[PDB]
RNA sequence: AGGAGGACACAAACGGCGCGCG
């Protein structure tokens, strides 16, 4: 929902979904580009925690 | 002369902090 002026009120679930989507897209991008095992492990841990 | 031809619809939100009252 917007608030007074050209701004939208912060939504809790939206930000969590945004974090999850960004992390998962980064993981997909790396897995396409064959990142090293250490990097993909760290990305997978970050995705799980997100 | 005769004769012939010729736009309908549509009324303000969500979480903290503080205070106060029952």
Curated annotation (Swiss-Prot):
Top-level taxonomic group: Bacteria
Purpose of the protein: DNA-dependent RNA polymerase catalyzes the transcription of DNA into RNA using the four ribonucleoside triphosphates as substrates.
Protein family: Belongs to the RNA polymerase beta' chain family.
Assembly behavior: The RNAP catalytic core consists of 2 alpha, 1 beta, 1 beta' and 1 omega subunit. When a sigma factor is associated with the core the holoenzyme is formed, which can initiate transcription.
Protein name (database record): DNA-directed RNA polymerase subunit beta'
């Amino acid at each position: 929902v917007p608030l007074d002026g050209g701004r939208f009120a912060t939504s809790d679930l939206n930000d969590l979904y945004r974090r999850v989507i960004n992390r998962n897209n980064r993981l997909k991008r790396l897995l396409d580009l064959a990142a090293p095992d250490i990097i993909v492990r760290n990305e997978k841990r970050m995705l799980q925690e997100a």
